[PDB]
C-alpha cells in the first residue's frame, strides 16, 4: 500500500508524510539485524503541552534488504497542524532520531487515477484523469504528465496547473507507441510536500 | 447569506474571507454617497507573476445605511495560498485600501447543519447531533461550539465541542423549559487563521417535568 510511497520517499533519515492532511506516517530504514524487531525501539511524540506518548511501531521488509520501522499516529493527534516533536531511541534508551514535523509540510498524495486517453483527432490525444481519491482542496493540486514512446524512445513532460484534471497533447509523432502517466502534489500554497507516484499508465498507438 | 457572513466580519477596513479554502471575497463598507457607485472605485490585485488585474466591484445595501462594495475573485486566482496583494482605489486614483493576505488566513466557514436534539436520560439529559458545514475540506480540523439557551430570566451556556467530533451531551437542563440549540464552526487553527461561522439554524426542544 504505502510500500511504494516510502520507497519513493526514501530520498536513511526519519521520514514523515501525510496522505490527506489528517494523518501522518513516519518511518526509517536500517540493515536487518538478528533478533531486532519493533519491540527493540521506542517511538515517542508530543503535542503542545501534552505528555509524550508512544507510537505502536511496525517492521516490514524492503525491496532492498534493509528493514523499515513505521508508526501511524493515532487519528486524534493528527487532526490539526500543531507541530509534532518526534523522538526515536533504542529500547535501551540509546538515541537515534529526534525532530519536529508540521503535517502541512510533508504532503505526499496518492497517484492520480482513472487515466484514459482518447485519440479524438484523426493526431491529437485527449487525456483525462481523476485526482488522488479522498483528497481535499483538489484545486491546489498540480499535475505532471509523462509522455514516453519507444527504437531509442524519448520522454517529454507537460505541466498541468491550477488543478485541471485533463489536457490535450499535440505534436505527437505519427504511427508510434505512447505511454502516458500522471502524478500530483500541492502547488505549495501552504503545503510542503513531494510529487506523488506516477499513476497506472495507459498506452495508445498513433495512426 | 453573503450578507450573513459580511455582517459578522464587519463586527471598517477591507475584509476578505474564504468559505472553502479555494475562493475569496473582499469588501468594505462606507456611508451612502449620492453619485457614488461601484464605477467610482477600482479593485486591483496581483499574485504569482500575474500582471495586476481588476475585479468587478458590486454595490449592495447593508442593514444600517452604509453601503457595501464587494469583489469575488475568479476561481483561477483563488487556487493557492500564495500571497495576494489587494488594493482599492477611487476612480480618481486616490488610495482607499491596501493589504497583503493569504486565503488561509481568513477562513469564514458556512454554519454547521442537521442539528437534531433529543433526550437520553431522565435527570435532565439531552444529546446534540449535527454534521459539519457542507462541501467543506478538512472536517477533522473543524472545532465547534454549542449554544444552549432557554427562554423567565432565561439562560445561555456554551459547550466547546472537541476537534472534528460532531456529537454533544447536555445535562442538568431545567425542568419543563424550552431549550434552543445552535452550533457554530471554526477551522481549528492548525495553520488556518479565521473567524467563527454564524450560528447554525437553531433546534428547539421542550423539557419534561
UniProtKB/Swiss-Prot annotation, chain A:
Associated disease:
Erythrocytosis, familial, 1: An autosomal dominant disorder characterized by elevated hemoglobin and hematocrit, hypersensitivity of erythroid progenitors to erythropoietin, erythropoietin low serum levels, and no increase in platelets nor leukocytes. It has a relatively benign course and does not progress to leukemia.
Assembly state and interactors? Forms homodimers on EPO stimulation. The tyrosine-phosphorylated form interacts with several SH2 domain-containing proteins including LYN, the adapter protein SH2B2, PTPN6, PTPN11, JAK2, PI3 kinases, STAT5A/B, SOCS3, CRKL. Interacts with INPP5D/SHIP1. SH2B2 binding inhibits the JAK-STAT signaling. Interacts with RHEX; this interaction occurs in a erythropoietin (EPO)-dependent manner. Interacts with ATXN2L.
Described function: Receptor for erythropoietin, which mediates erythropoietin-induced erythroblast proliferation and differentiation. Upon EPO stimulation, EPOR dimerizes triggering the JAK2/STAT5 signaling cascade. In some cell types, can also activate STAT1 and STAT3. May also activate the LYN tyrosine kinase.
Q: What is the effect of changing residue 140 to A?
A: Little effect on EPO binding
Domain observations: The WSXWS motif appears to be necessary for proper protein folding and thereby efficient intracellular transport and cell-surface receptor binding. The box 1 motif is required for JAK interaction and/or activation.
> Where does it localize?
Cell membrane
Q: Residue limits of the Fibronectin type-III domain?
A: 111-207
In which organism is this protein found? Homo sapiens
Q: Where can the motif WSXWS motif be found?
A: 195-199
Q: What is the effect of changing residue 78 to A?
A: Little effect on EPO binding
The organs and tissues expressing this protein are described as:
Erythroid cells and erythroid progenitor cells.
- List cystine links: 16-26, 55-71
UniProt-recorded name of the protein: Erythropoietin receptor
Reproduce the UniProt comment on modification after translation. Answer: On EPO stimulation, phosphorylated on C-terminal tyrosine residues by JAK2. The phosphotyrosine motifs are also recruitment sites for several SH2-containing proteins and adapter proteins which mediate cell proliferation.
Site feature Required for ligand binding: at which residues? 81
Q: Which residues lie on this side of the membrane: Extracellular?
A: 1-207
Q: Tell me which family the UniProt entry assigns to this protein.
A: Belongs to the type I cytokine receptor family. Type 1 subfamily.
UniProt-annotated glycosylation sites, renumbered to this chain: 40
